[PDB]
């Protein structure tokens, strides 16, 4: 009853496409989310012309929704009420300290807003109406999980940055010049796929019928979502995270001096959906890249 195993069938009855969970271990992991999950500030929006001096992204939400967003951002990245993490608290408009040194955390967070809008807006085929907010990666802390840096050339995480192409199986009976993939390349795909399975806490049958890994018809629909996750991470890493290299202090950078990069586990944290599917982004229109969320229209001043 606690050493018991929960199982979920995800394919046709005789196929053994099934997910197995230790019951005890799973309710432990679930509780460790469901208690720390942070309460949002209540909704509001009054009128008025925007007073902001140096607002470059959020200049499309009301003044209460803006202030509400800052309370959320501090709660999600830095602990609640910790506006000092990003700001010269006497001069919220400033992007530098009194010393003139840049408030690197504020410059990053401005880019993280653009990135979050880009995720929620352009990659709905992945995040759908669950969406993401700062809490998805940061979970109350400055550093997300799953940060990775340059190392070996053959490091499989570069599938999420500059590489493309993991396929190794032939779409035909006879050998051909079309597919000359090595068995070593199948080993590399296999290593990559173990990483994805662990990132979601699932097994291969969550996304494949392993009698034919290449097949989409025999695979669950989740495989299609997973593919959009790869395309999303490449955009996130190439256009937002990796180019932040000059902004960070050197203590945040890799041995090659590269900026930290994300991977599937950064959002998923070992769960099939991030935060077991907690739907927060619907509460924070500042972070939609969309004119409406699940039919609810954007407040739009």
């Amino acid at each position: 009853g606690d050493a018991a195993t929960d199982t979920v069938q995800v394919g046709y009855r005789g196929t053994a496409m099934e997910q197995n969970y230790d019951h005890g271990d799973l309710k432990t992991k679930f509780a460790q989310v469901k208690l720390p999950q942070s309460p949002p500030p209540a909704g509001e929006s009054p009128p008025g012309p925007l007073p902001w001096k140096n607002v470059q992204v959020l200049n499309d939400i009301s003044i209460a929704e803006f202030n509400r967003t800052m309370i959320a951002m501090s709660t999600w990245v830095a602990g609640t009420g910790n506006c000092a993490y990003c700001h010269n608290v006497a001069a919220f408009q400033d992007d530098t300290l009194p010393n003139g040194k840049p408030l690197y955390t504020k410059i990053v967070a401005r880019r993280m807003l653009q990135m979050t809008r880009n995720i929620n807006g352009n990659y709905s085929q992945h995040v759908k109406n669950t969406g993401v907010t700062c809490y998805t990666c940061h979970m109350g802390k400055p550093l997300p999980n799953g940060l990775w840096f340059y190392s070996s050339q053959t490091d499989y995480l570069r599938h999420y940055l500059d590489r493309d192409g993991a396929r190794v199986i032939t779409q035909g009976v006879a050998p051909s010049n079309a597919n000359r993939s090595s068995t070593k390349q199948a080993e590399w795909t296999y290593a990559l796929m173990i990483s994805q399975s662990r990132s979601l806490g699932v097994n291969c049958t969550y996304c494949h019928n392993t009698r034919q890994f290449a097949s989409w018809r025999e695979a669950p629909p989740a495989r299609v979502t997973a593919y959009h996750g790869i395309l999303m991470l490449r955009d996130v890493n190439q256009n937002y995270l990796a180019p932040l290299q000059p902004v960070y202090p050197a203590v945040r950078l890799g041995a090659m001096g590269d900026a930290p990069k994300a991977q599937c586990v950064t959002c998923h944290n070992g769960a099939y959906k991030p935060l077991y599917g907690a739907q927060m982004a619907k509460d924070f229109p500042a972070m939609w890249g969309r004119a409406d969320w699940n039919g609810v229209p954007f407040p739009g001043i």
Binding site: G165, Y190, N209, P221
Partner: protein, 323 residues
Amino acid sequence: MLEYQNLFTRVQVRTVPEPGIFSYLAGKFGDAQIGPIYLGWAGVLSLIFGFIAIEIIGLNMWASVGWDPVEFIRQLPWLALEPPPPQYGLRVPPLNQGGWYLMAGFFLTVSIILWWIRIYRRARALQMGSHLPWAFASAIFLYSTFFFQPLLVGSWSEMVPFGIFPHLDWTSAFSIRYGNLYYNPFHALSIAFLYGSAVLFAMHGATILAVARMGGEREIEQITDRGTAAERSMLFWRWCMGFNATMESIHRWAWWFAVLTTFTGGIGILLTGTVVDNWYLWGVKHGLVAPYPAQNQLTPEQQDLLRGRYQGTAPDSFPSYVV
């Protein structure tokens, strides 16, 4: 453990002088020397070539953990000596990039062949049929396909890595690459004979122990001068399943089932990537594949979007995104 015959429970016996007219003879059955474990010229050479093969494998594994002897033991099942890179095809590769691999593979192969010579010569010298050397030849046939199939597809990169878990990674990846080896009919046959070998030796082992108190284990006497132990063994199976072997012919069934395991295995490997590149699709063609209801359906737009790309080279640079 306890046993259902007295024969060596207690009152085991010592020949204080030698048996062969515990202890051992020093003499000859014909021209064959009977004392030491036999080697001859081929046995001696086989040990030298095989020693250097094993020594090359071990030293490369140990170098791969930076000579650390703690990590050499701790990480041992994950260590490997690995085949050359794919781009070399059949050309000689760099020493640290598969040159030691092909060297160890060569010395191991010669060592195996010389061990077959040894067994063949010893069987002749003891005035025995050549059944055992040809049984061993069937195993060598399967082993050799781990050279010939890489040769026929044109790259030493496709060879099996020397290493406990790494060769199992290769075994899985080979099935992944060629579209599920379960649909290779010679793999299916090889399994049928592998299982049949366990069926037969369970049946035969149990049968002979079930008549051992009547001398059934003295199978050469029962073959040349049939006793009641042989008769009862024949009748048990005849009454059980409607047909029976003899004391001699059950050893032929045993011989062929074992031999056909590696023989059909070798053919299935040689066919893979040379004649058939996707065994599941070969299974569809020839009607092996059971239909399941569709788990997903793609639009025409997804059929082009979800086409992947075949895997290429790793990036040989560390790009800056400074902009």
